[PDB]
Symmetry: D3
Subunit: 173 residues, 6 copies
């Protein structure tokens, strides 16, 4: 069950996202993690977040979905509380080092990472989603991203900077 080899970790590029949504091509978790890392780096710096917080979010962004090399990438609505608790233990066996980073992550770094994880999905579907259901998922994810940020421990000024950067970015995507 545990992922221990580089040949297995390289299969991040063989893991297809958007399993229940029509898209122009099958996006993999490697390109997703690189783009989430990029957003953490750029938007964490734009929001004036502490260097240690941005570094922690970037480090997590690069490996955060590695358990999907075994589990597959399940659609967010499927992950109900009872399923997520079972998945938490399974993912801890698959990628113990990722579980350790997750357990150490400061709340501010977690909120920067989660904002970027969701923003990357909205930005991806803006270009590559096909059809009414994909349109609805893109808009639902944007609504969820905003609500989570608004209710987060991030300072209002930081939330505003993140939304300022997100809106500017999606307009040119």
């Amino acid at each position: 069950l545990q992922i221990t080899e580089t040949y297995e970790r390289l299969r991040a590029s063989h893991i297809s996202r958007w399993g229940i949504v029509q898209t122009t091509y099958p996006q993999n978790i490697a390109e997703h993690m690189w783009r989430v890392w990029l957003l953490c780096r750029d938007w964490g710096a734009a929001a004036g977040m502490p260097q240690h917080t941005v570094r922690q979010a970037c480090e997590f962004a690069l490996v955060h979905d590695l358990a999907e090399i075994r589990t597959g990438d399940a659609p967010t609505p499927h992950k109900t509380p009872e399923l997520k608790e079972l998945l938490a233990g399974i993912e801890a066996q698959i990628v113990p080092e990722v579980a350790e980073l997750e357990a150490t992550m400061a709340p501010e770094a977690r909120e920067l990472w989660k904002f970027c994880d969701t923003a990357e999905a909205v930005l991806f579907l803006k270009v590559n989603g096909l059809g009414a259901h994909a349109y609805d998922v893109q808009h639902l994810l944007m609504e969820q991203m905003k609500r989570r940020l608004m209710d987060s421990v991030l300072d209002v000024e930081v939330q505003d900077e993140l939304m300022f950067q997100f809106e500017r970015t999606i307009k040119k995507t």
Copy 2:
């Protein structure tokens, strides 16, 4: 959670299979279910199985993976006993009519269906799998298909006919 609309059921063609395996293109559950239905029809008749048993397996084959319109298509190794029990209840809420057909299916029809469900995957990867991991998965699925058939309630003569047809088919695929 429950699937109630034709526009949702049509999304069987938007559900991508092989979420953790490299393939030439993203196969969807609609083409998979049609091919499993075809194998149940042809191989059930070739094995001289009772018409009622073949009909039951074909009817189940056409809708068996419909819950994946909500859950996504998780890789078989991920479905451990504890996860499968949680998934059974969730899938019963998603597609109650499919759960009812599954609960009514006779053991012989279930074994014909399962043999065809797995054979379709091996046949698909024979043409469309890419790389060492896909090669291993194709061979593991074939080994699992054979072991399940060998330990099933199907008569030895029926198991032999099914293996006779499977081997002839894969050689020309």
Copy 3:
């Protein structure tokens, strides 16, 4: 010429549709037949059509385009009366069992099947068609679907139910 083997019938997933229309990906006849079957099942029941009529349309839907494993999937405008008469005889040699089902099909089951065969194409292009010509073909097929239904032997109440379901479905596709 005759299709006699399961390895040949499995090639329904190797037969590409939309040979002269730009699309996001090459849809195959297996996913098409599964979706047409689904529409016959759901919309035949929604329209309150007799169970025997719905069953006949569903049975035909699952195999109706199998001759295309040999002929290829020719674009509808190409099939003029003189060509269709030649193709009828060729297809009868390729898939005699499909020709027998076609010859037995009741007019009401044929009209439910044809409405669903065309509706599936319009629904597919709504999501996956690319460009002006694909847009025109999607709209021409919808116009043809409506005209055929309006001039059919189906009761006005059944035609209205089918159009009610079609419009609701395409709006969410």
Copy 4:
């Protein structure tokens, strides 16, 4: 029916080949015609064929499959003598200018063109064909290409040069 506009002729790149054969991607008739033209140019010159003969074959190669913008690209085995006679008249209405070039083509230019038309298909499948059926079609086309060349009006020395170039080319493709 007649193709009269540049926007229609540009749809050569929207016409998918290999309608009944599994391939890595959908090759269009525009890339096919360019490659057939290239083979006529290079191999006609390598075989020392008269400049007028090579020019005629190249000119035909560039437009030879244009009627498929309306008809679709039917698989060669489907084109039986009776169907080909009906298709000849239909294609003459679709592309009268292509029909005129075909009617004027000298036997030697026709044989250079046909050798290149078939060789391009074998070369394409060598790289992009997937599965047993595609393998068989690639080998059947090569056998047909050789038999037609061997029975043609081309001088033995020209046939040998064409086969010499074909074998060298496929080895490095």
Copy 5:
């Protein structure tokens, strides 16, 4: 460095265009050159250009991007004056025969070819471009195509015919 073999020239279909722009699929230089040739042929004749000028533009269109079999297809904005001078010498070593045709091309044939080379790209992106950046590139290329034509040695009447045909074509693409 020099391209000398037919197996290398056949790789025109392995050279992907739009290296920095999101598209529905990877268009190759073979389909591009065929479409540019088609536009030169049709639009050169529609504009009443001399037969020798149209022939020269068509001949160049068919081979003009062959050096990209070695260089790759670099995005137009990247080709600054200093880089283009270095590339001119490299391309002359790669495809000496293409360099000779380019050096012989009359200004009017060059302007017909360049108008068609750019128009083909705008027409391609109209159907197959994805996202804001692809939209901007499509519109920038159209602006560049118009400005170059307006400042060219072509007679105003010829420029008007070319724009008349371009606008009619894109409206139906």
Copy 6:
């Protein structure tokens, strides 16, 4: 010319690699950079390289090909000494921050990064390359990777560990 915006950096996933080589799909520079980063992290640690050296190679791996968002991804054989000198200055204007990291990189970190940059390409083509030319490029890149490592400043023990890990990885890819 300079890349200054996150919406531009996100286009790493719109930059297609392998511009002159046939592949199963168009790999982008984002998935490439993530995989190169992964190889630097895992193989740098496996080789017992100093933590500061591994960190420097990983940091460079994540952004090393960002200038290709403007330049496109040119094939390695095209980058001759004279072209590389011109490209060095252009890339310094496009991504000044990447140029600064490159200028600061220690020789050992550069050799770990370059080994991983090339190994990722060989591993990618092992699964996704199509045809004779792609096969030759995969083998040429492996030969180049080995020769550069053998002539590098890395200790023989480190070179042996890197080759030990590379061979184990490719066997299971």
